[PDB]
Structure formats: C-alpha cells, structure tokens
Design a binder for this molecule. Structure first.
Ligand code: HEM
Ligand SMILES: O=C(CCCCn1ccnc1)N[C@@H](Cc1ccccc1)C(=O)O
Ligand SMILES: c1ccc2c(c1)CCC2
Length: 451
C-alpha cells in the first residue's frame, strides 16, 4: 500500500512539519489514492480517503475511535473529556450518556435564546461598522462561537465582541492547542529548548483549569439552575453507572466543549460565508430563505429549523472543508480493510474527511464545486459519504448545537446584510487543529432590517 515521501529515520513525519498538514495530507491522498500508509518515528497510521474504505472503518463493531497524537496531547488539558476519552474509559460513556440529552435538537430549544443573544451581538457589531469598513470573518465567527459556547455551556460571557485581545482563558487555550500541535513535530521533547514551551503549557493548563473550576465552584456554591450544559453536568446521573460526573471531569468537559465551540464551529461559519460570497447565486438563494423564514426581529427556534437551504449551505461548506478534518480509528480486532488491506488488531486509521468528501465516485467529478444543492435531500447521500461530525457513538455530540448555531447566525447574517468579497479574497486555510479561512474579510452592507 502506497506511502508518501520519507525523511530517513523521520519517515513521513516531516511532512506534517508544515503550516497546513491537513492540506498536505489531502494532496498526498490525491496522489496516492484512497489509502496511504503514514509512518512517524515509533508510529504508523493509514490515511483513508475513499467512502469505500471509510464506510468500513466506520463499522463500530470493527473499529473504535483512536486518539490521534493530537488528541493525546490535547488530552493533557481536555483529560478524559468526551472528545479525548477512549470509548472504553468509563468516563466516556458516563459523560456521553449524561450529556447526550443536553445536545439533542430538543435541547437546542433551550440554548436557542442564548445563541440568539450572541448572534444578535454579531449582527449588531456588523450593523455598526462604518462604510468601507470590513469584517474579519474568522475572527468574528470565533467571537460568536466561543461566546455562544460560553453562554450555552456554563452561562459565562466571554464578551468577545467587547475585546480585541481574547479572554485570558482563550489566550491560554489557543496557546495550549499550538503547543499540542507543535509537539507532534518535537523529536526530543525533554530538550531544555522546550523548557519554556512546556512551562508555558503547564501555565496554560493550570490557567484554564483554575478558571473553569472556579466557574464550577461558583455554580455549585450559588446553587442556581440555568438551562445550560453545566447545570446538566452538575445534576446529570449516568443511567448506566448511576453516577454523576465528578468535578474534574465536568471541568474537562467544559474545556472540551469550549474548544469544540471555538474555531471548529467558527470555521464552518467562515467557510460558509466564504463560499456564499464566492457563489452569489447560492448567497441569493440562502438570503431569500433567511428573509422568508426569519420574519421576526429575532429568530425563533422553529424558524431556524426552517432554514433548510442555509443548512444545506452549511453541509456543503462542511463537505469541502470539514473544520474537524480528521478522526482516528483503530482496529478492535484483526481485520481486512476493503478486502485488500489486512489490518492487525490495534492498527490505526485516519479518516481524511476533506478527501472523503471529495470522493468523485460518491459526489461526481465536480467535488471541488460548492453546490449546496448536493444536500437538497440527505437520502441521496450514501452511507458514510459525509462525516464532518465523525462516526457512530464517537460522533460529534455537539453536531446539533453547531448546526443550530451556524444556521442561526448564518440565517441572521443573510437576513441583515448583503455581503461583498471586496478583496477577491484568496482562500488561505490556516490550520491549527481545525480549519479556518485565514484573512477572510468581507464588507457587510446592512439591509437596514431592525432587530
Ligand atoms: C461544525 C462544527 C463541528 C464539527 C465539524 C465537529 C466535528 C467533530 C468530529 C468529526 C468529531 C469526532 C471526533 C473524533 O472522532 O475524533 C467530533 C466530536 C466531538 N465534538 Fe464536535 N464538531 C463540531 C462542533 C462541536 C461543538 C460546537 C461542540 C460542543 C459541544 C462539539 C463537541 C464535540 C465533542 C464533545 C466530541 C466528542 C464526542 C465523543 O467522542 O463522544 N463539537 N466533532
Ligand atoms: O487528526 C488530527 C487531529 C486534529 C484534527 C482532527 N480533529 C480536529 C477536531 N476534531 C478532530 N489531525 C490530522 C491533520 C493534522 C496533522 C498534523 C498536525 C495538525 C493536523 C492528522 O492527524 O493527520
Ligand atoms: C482536535 C482539537 C480539538 C478538539 C478536537 C480535535 C476534538 C475536541 C476538541
């Protein structure tokens, strides 16, 4: 099975020593095909890029979520949070059972008001820009998604729209993600040259924890009951174990939720807006839906649900640029992938989601084309062709949350503003552990529809 270029005893790893690893892996997948072996010092994985192989990798009886090395280093501050837990860790299923009810569509009804609060701030920010002033979309979308998660996660207002510099927690979080990412390429981590990087990391860990732990201490001491995630975690009992989440895990979940609602959802929104400004027909179509559906000053939960084409737009953005572009799997037992690639128990797989979503055998040759109409009816989408939210029980618990928020804000965006790609913006995808269109800027001309 094919393997990309090697670097001596570093094997393929230097390939990831790049600003854009996911995009690097995508061009490799284009070159080598539906599967290529990727080796690193003391590490081997197989990057899947075809729906044919990924539908099998997505067989949960055969493959379980693996923690990529990224998630393992993110586990250093997300602990046994849902996303950095192994399926077999008691806390995963515990936290999964406790939180699944907090992430359903019906759960969204409760979060809708808080999402709108933040969404209106975004709209008001843009309403208040001066002529010829532009929007830094990614930046503003991150302000929105991070504040949405804060408010919805634990009634905390990061007030990102009141800031140029991010909240101290977010400075530490983003810094720890960068350390986690950087340390994929670190051969000798204990080298003194990384003393301060590691000290900085422990500073960032100790920072996020104390700040999140206090918020949990604040809530439990005040004894107040909001309708946010944190209430559900303080009061939730895992029906299986019967146990509630202990404080350490709740904190890990909060940190987990804050990261997932940071640049991962923000990315979708930024990619969506990019594609909408690059495809005005799509924009017109989405904006006319937003105008037809969002007939009230502030969107209702039910109106957001009726933003079908906006959801299609989001799905098509998720197709071309899944902002969580990969998830790792391991073979629970000896198995053969596709009848071609024998896998031993424990062998690791990587689902290169952007590449899957470019599977011409599933979507046709125009995979690069942004056409939300691909998602007119989800029944036309084959099993496991579209996995921007992962797979099975380890799929994104926050998918409904992310889509409701993104549809909401996008709907409101299209309702209240005509958008101009005033720079003929050249899509430049910055890669952290998520994808975002770097330097994506637009001008938003208010439609002068009051809020
Ligand atoms: C469009 C935005 C989002 C995308 C594309 C996305 C994508 C994904 C993907 C692919 C996974 C599976 C990861 C894996 O298997 O390793 C996942 C897991 C997860 N996501 Fe999201 N996600 C998004 C938004 C959110 C938000 C807003 C939250 C906030 C709660 C969230 C929370 C989680 C959690 C907790 C997991 C782990 C679930 C589990 O393992 O049980 N995500 N996400
Ligand atoms: O798999 C992950 C973990 C992060 C992306 C997956 N992700 C994000 C949110 N949820 C899941 N990276 C991919 C791509 C990559 C490689 C090196 C450095 C950065 C990114 C890989 O390992 O090849
Ligand atoms: C990479 C980076 C961050 C996160 C994931 C993957 C899933 C949870 C949050």
């Amino acid at each position: 099975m094919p393997q990309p270029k090697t670097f001596g005893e570093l094997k393929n790893l230097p390939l990831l020593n790049t600003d854009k690893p996911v995009q690097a892996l995508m061009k490799i997948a284009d070159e080598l095909g539906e599967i290529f072996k990727f080796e690193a010092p003391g590490r081997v994985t197989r990057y899947l890029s075809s729906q044919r192989l990924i539908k099998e990798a997505c067989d949960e009886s055969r493959f379980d979520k693996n923690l990529s090395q990224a998630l393992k280093f993110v586990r250093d501050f997300c602990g046994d949070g849902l996303a950095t837990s192994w399926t077999h860790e008691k806390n995963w299923k515990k936290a999964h059972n406790i939180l699944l009810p907090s992430f359903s569509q019906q759960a969204m009804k409760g979060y809708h008001a808080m999402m709108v609060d933040i969404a209106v701030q975004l709209v008001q920010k843009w309403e208040r820009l001066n002529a010829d002033e532009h929007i830094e979309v990614p930046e503003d979308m991150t302000r929105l998604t991070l504040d949405t998660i804060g408010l919805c996660g634990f009634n905390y207002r990061f007030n990102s729209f009141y800031r140029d510099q991010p909240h101290p927690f977010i400075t530490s979080m983003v810094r720890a993600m960068d350390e986690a990412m950087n340390k994929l390429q670190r051969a000798n981590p204990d080298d003194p040259a990384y003393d301060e990087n590691k000290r900085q990391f422990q500073e960032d860990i100790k920072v996020m924890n104390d700040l999140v732990d206090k918020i949990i201490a604040d809530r439990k001491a005040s004894g107040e009951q909001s309708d946010d995630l944190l209430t559900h975690m303080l009061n939730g009992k895992d029906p299986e174990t019967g146990e509630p989440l202990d404080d350490e895990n709740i904190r890990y979940q909060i940190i987990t939720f804050l990261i997932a609602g940071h640049e991962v959802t923000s990315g979708l929104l930024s990619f969506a807006l990019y594609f909408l400004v690059k495809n005005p027909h799509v924009l017109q179509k989405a904006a006319e839906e937003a105008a037809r559906v969002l007939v009230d000053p502030v969107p209702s939960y039910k109106q957001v649900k009726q933003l079908k084409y906006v959801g299609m737009v989001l799905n098509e953005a998720l197709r071309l640029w899944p902002t969580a572009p990969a998830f790792s799997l391991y073979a629970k037992e000896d198995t053969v992938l596709g009848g071609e690639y024998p896998l031993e128990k424990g062998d690791e797989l990587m689902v290169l989601i952007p590449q899957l979503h470019r599977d011409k055998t599933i979507w046709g040759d125009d995979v690069e084309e942004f056409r939300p109409e691909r998602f007119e009816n989800p029944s036309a989408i084959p099993q496991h062709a579209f996995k921007p939210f992962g797979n099975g029980q380890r799929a994104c618990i926050g998918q409904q949350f992310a889509l409701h928020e993104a549809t909401l804000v996008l709907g409101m965006m299209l309702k209240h503003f005509d958008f101009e790609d005033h720079t003929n913006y050249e899509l430049d995808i910055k890669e952290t552990l998520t994808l975002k269109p770097e330097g994506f800027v637009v001008k938003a001309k208010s439609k002068k529809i009051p809020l």
